[PDB]
Design a protein around this motif. Sequence first.
Motif, mmCIF file in Angstrom:
data_model
loop_
_atom_site.group_PDB
_atom_site.id
_atom_site.type_symbol
_atom_site.label_atom_id
_atom_site.label_comp_id
_atom_site.label_asym_id
_atom_site.label_seq_id
_atom_site.Cartn_x
_atom_site.Cartn_y
_atom_site.Cartn_z
ATOM 1 N N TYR B 223 -14.594 -26.903 -12.332
ATOM 2 C CA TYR B 223 -14.447 -25.670 -11.563
ATOM 3 C C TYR B 223 -15.342 -24.597 -12.166
ATOM 4 C CZ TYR B 223 -10.251 -28.422 -10.673
ATOM 5 O OH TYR B 223 -9.384 -29.461 -10.413
ATOM 6 N N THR B 224 -16.126 -23.941 -11.315
ATOM 7 C CA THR B 224 -17.059 -22.920 -11.736
ATOM 8 C C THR B 224 -17.063 -21.799 -10.709
ATOM 9 O OG1 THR B 224 -18.868 -24.093 -10.638
ATOM 10 C CG2 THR B 224 -18.533 -24.531 -12.972
ATOM 11 N N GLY B 225 -17.916 -20.804 -10.969
ATOM 12 C CA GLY B 225 -18.031 -19.604 -10.167
ATOM 13 C C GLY B 225 -17.568 -18.343 -10.876
ATOM 14 N N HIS B 226 -16.636 -18.472 -11.835
ATOM 15 C CA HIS B 226 -16.133 -17.317 -12.566
ATOM 16 C C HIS B 226 -17.015 -17.028 -13.785
ATOM 17 C CE1 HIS B 226 -14.761 -20.755 -14.686
ATOM 18 N NE2 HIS B 226 -14.079 -20.065 -15.586
ATOM 19 N N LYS B 227 -16.660 -15.982 -14.543
ATOM 20 C CA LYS B 227 -17.355 -15.600 -15.775
ATOM 21 C C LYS B 227 -16.446 -15.864 -16.975
ATOM 22 C CE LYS B 227 -20.803 -14.034 -13.329
ATOM 23 N NZ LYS B 227 -21.259 -15.337 -12.755
ATOM 24 N N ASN B 228 -16.917 -16.678 -17.910
ATOM 25 C CA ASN B 228 -16.112 -16.927 -19.094
ATOM 26 C C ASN B 228 -17.049 -17.425 -20.198
ATOM 27 O OD1 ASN B 228 -13.956 -17.109 -20.807
ATOM 28 N ND2 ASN B 228 -13.225 -19.054 -19.957
ATOM 29 N N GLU B 229 -17.593 -16.481 -20.949
ATOM 30 C CA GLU B 229 -18.426 -16.774 -22.090
ATOM 31 C C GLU B 229 -17.919 -16.145 -23.371
ATOM 32 O OE1 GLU B 229 -22.348 -15.459 -20.781
ATOM 33 O OE2 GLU B 229 -22.737 -17.427 -19.895
ATOM 34 N N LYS B 230 -16.884 -15.344 -23.321
ATOM 35 C CA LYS B 230 -16.522 -14.683 -24.557
ATOM 36 C C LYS B 230 -15.044 -14.777 -24.896
ATOM 37 C CE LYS B 230 -17.180 -10.193 -26.938
ATOM 38 N NZ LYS B 230 -15.835 -9.677 -27.324
ATOM 39 N N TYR B 231 -14.154 -14.577 -23.928
ATOM 40 C CA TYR B 231 -12.724 -14.453 -24.194
ATOM 41 C C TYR B 231 -11.989 -15.766 -23.961
ATOM 42 C CZ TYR B 231 -13.580 -9.585 -24.596
ATOM 43 O OH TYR B 231 -14.037 -8.380 -25.040
ATOM 44 N N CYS B 232 -10.870 -15.919 -24.658
ATOM 45 C CA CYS B 232 -10.035 -17.093 -24.476
ATOM 46 C C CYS B 232 -9.058 -16.801 -23.349
ATOM 47 C CB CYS B 232 -9.376 -17.474 -25.790
ATOM 48 S SG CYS B 232 -10.669 -18.185 -26.899
ATOM 49 N N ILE B 233 -9.482 -17.155 -22.142
ATOM 50 C CA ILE B 233 -8.761 -16.874 -20.907
ATOM 51 C C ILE B 233 -7.829 -18.037 -20.595
ATOM 52 C CG2 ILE B 233 -9.013 -16.245 -18.480
ATOM 53 C CD1 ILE B 233 -11.619 -15.097 -18.968
ATOM 54 N N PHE B 234 -6.564 -17.717 -20.347
ATOM 55 C CA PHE B 234 -5.533 -18.692 -20.013
ATOM 56 C C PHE B 234 -5.651 -19.102 -18.549
ATOM 57 C CE2 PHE B 234 -1.643 -20.139 -22.198
ATOM 58 C CZ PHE B 234 -0.974 -20.802 -21.169
ATOM 59 N N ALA B 235 -5.535 -20.397 -18.279
ATOM 60 C CA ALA B 235 -5.609 -20.915 -16.916
ATOM 61 C C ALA B 235 -4.325 -21.674 -16.599
ATOM 62 C CB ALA B 235 -6.841 -21.820 -16.730
ATOM 63 N N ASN B 236 -4.167 -22.060 -15.332
ATOM 64 C CA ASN B 236 -2.917 -22.682 -14.908
ATOM 65 C C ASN B 236 -3.147 -23.628 -13.749
ATOM 66 O OD1 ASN B 236 -2.142 -19.563 -15.540
ATOM 67 N ND2 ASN B 236 -0.687 -21.025 -16.425
ATOM 68 N N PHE B 237 -2.223 -24.578 -13.620
ATOM 69 C CA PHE B 237 -1.998 -25.316 -12.384
ATOM 70 C C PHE B 237 -0.992 -24.540 -11.541
ATOM 71 C CE2 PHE B 237 -4.049 -29.285 -13.692
ATOM 72 C CZ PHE B 237 -3.983 -29.203 -15.074
ATOM 73 N N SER B 238 -1.342 -24.265 -10.298
ATOM 74 C CA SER B 238 -0.390 -23.699 -9.360
ATOM 75 C C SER B 238 0.115 -24.837 -8.480
ATOM 76 C CB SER B 238 -1.035 -22.602 -8.525
ATOM 77 O OG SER B 238 -0.105 -22.131 -7.583
ATOM 78 N N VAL B 239 1.426 -25.076 -8.515
ATOM 79 C CA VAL B 239 2.015 -26.226 -7.842
ATOM 80 C C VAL B 239 3.143 -25.856 -6.887
ATOM 81 C CG1 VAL B 239 1.359 -27.730 -9.754
ATOM 82 C CG2 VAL B 239 3.626 -26.659 -9.701
ATOM 83 N N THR B 240 3.533 -24.579 -6.793
ATOM 84 C CA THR B 240 4.681 -24.256 -5.947
ATOM 85 C C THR B 240 4.352 -24.409 -4.469
ATOM 86 O OG1 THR B 240 4.104 -21.911 -6.130
ATOM 87 C CG2 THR B 240 5.836 -22.762 -7.592
ATOM 88 N N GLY B 241 3.092 -24.197 -4.088
ATOM 89 C CA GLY B 241 2.659 -24.329 -2.711
ATOM 90 C C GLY B 241 1.493 -25.287 -2.619
ATOM 91 N N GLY B 242 0.334 -24.798 -2.199
ATOM 92 C CA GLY B 242 -0.887 -25.561 -2.368
ATOM 93 C C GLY B 242 -1.135 -25.912 -3.825
ATOM 94 N N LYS B 243 -1.991 -26.912 -4.043
ATOM 95 C CA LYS B 243 -2.307 -27.361 -5.398
ATOM 96 C C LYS B 243 -3.585 -26.642 -5.807
ATOM 97 C CE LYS B 243 1.335 -29.808 -5.358
ATOM 98 N NZ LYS B 243 2.426 -29.899 -6.376
#
Lengths: 303, 305
Positions: B223-243
């Motif tokens: 997955y790409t398109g965002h900006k992430n070169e410096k900070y430790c950004i938390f990500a998630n699986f969203s499963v309550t509706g769409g995946k």
Amino acid sequence: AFRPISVFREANEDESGFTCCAFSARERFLMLGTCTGQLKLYNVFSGQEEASYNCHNSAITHLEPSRDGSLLLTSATWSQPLSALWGMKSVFDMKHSFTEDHYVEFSKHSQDRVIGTKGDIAHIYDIQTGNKLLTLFNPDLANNYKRNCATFNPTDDLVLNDGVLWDVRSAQAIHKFDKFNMNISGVFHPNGLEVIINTEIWDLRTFHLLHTVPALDQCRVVFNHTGTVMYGAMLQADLMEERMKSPFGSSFRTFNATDYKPIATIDVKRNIFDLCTDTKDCYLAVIENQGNMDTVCRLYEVG
Amino acid sequence: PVKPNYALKFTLAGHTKAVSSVKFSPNGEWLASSSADKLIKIWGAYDGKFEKTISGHKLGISDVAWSSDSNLLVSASDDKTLKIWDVSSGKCLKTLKGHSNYVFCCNFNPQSNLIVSGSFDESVRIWDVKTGKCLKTLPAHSDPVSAVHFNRDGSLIVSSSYDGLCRIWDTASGQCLKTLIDDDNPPVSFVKFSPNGKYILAATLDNTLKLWDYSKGKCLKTYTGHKNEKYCIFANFSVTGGKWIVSGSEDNLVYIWNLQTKEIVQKLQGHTDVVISTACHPTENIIASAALENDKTIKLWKSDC
């Protein structure tokens, strides 16, 4: 006394990230560290970036070229190795690394050694082998200066570390200077006969107090290459979990190196990251923040 | 292709420095937030209403985590400790000491008798919740540790590091059971197990998220398109509706991707600084985001799918 001659920002960057500078041996060129761990060579007059090398995985804080142009010390911020020694002859490459030393300097008379600082502790390394020759630390004599920087004296026979004067040959502490501030551990005057520890000027012949210089409080200093003028800028002052602040305030001052009498106070109206002069003291380069970090290098003529 | 329609419902103001981590309680009732301001705050997950402040750390907190029964918190602080908290009382039950530098990440195991921590000191530690004692120190990595997470049944720990590696650990023995590396080794700024335990989701500081079959050592999705070169950004699986895959971004947006197709399905605008933390509600299509020092707010977003 300081006529603007040239200005330039970092090429190819949204926000300009110069953090520190020193002139190189090759003349119209200045070496700059950046906030991304890169070392860059710039033509100080045109502003042209001439070369770029990736040195560290965190921001460069400080650098020092050897007088003969063959070697370079760098220090970074948090990533290991914290400091490194680079070969500049032919291919730019790492000669040795000083993995835990936040700060390093060359020896002064014969540049055959490196002195590193890790908190309260000094490490002396051999340039050719990179071997640690000496560790200097004595917990009974420590002053625990928060910005301690270990340093050789002009003839390399003495070390100042954490406000303790050391005899290198014997690896013995010969004198502890009392602690009168929280941060600054002090430097040797180029004349080899006194030390400058924050506001206190101590005689090395007698350990008497020669001068009280209040304007030097929290200051880093550097001398012109004749040892007749001293530049001083005051640290900005307070957990590495913060955004990047300039190390210095918005002014520096020059002092007569013999009696510490003020010569000039220069308020550039912008926070200062670094400054240096060329071996001939024709030029002063200052890294200045515009205004958030967005620095330029300004070149001034030394009158 | 169905898309979510996350829309801003509440902005939670109160922290006086960067917000480092937002987490929904497992029972869905609460949002806990940690901050550089040394404080933990509890908010109502459905109304965004402030509930209480929890204090005790001496320096910034970079992470906080809920126990399975929604009664305990653990927090990881730059003061080199973690703290176990009784949420209803606000009291510090244990201070976990042993790390030699900033503690960046923490989590309970599902059984809630262990805490895993990761530190600038390059170690991963496993602690006794009840005694507050360190059971194991793992020499996990050769650079700071950015995330640690138990798998669904607690038999595995995954860790990520600036050394460019993800590593899997056997909880019981402490033995490293897998080292994940792909074509390059940019810093691994985040990692966690998928809800079904079969995959890991790892962020690297090259603007990339990757879904990994860690058994087979295969990257399945990028997955790409965002900006992430410096900070430790938390990500998630969203499963309550769409995946979906959900992450913050250094351009101040929340990004949402279709997990299967990898296309960006929504970008949530509103924050004024790096969105360094996101969380997905355990049962409703609700997202919390939190931003850094020049924003200082948490935001709650709700979607129909």
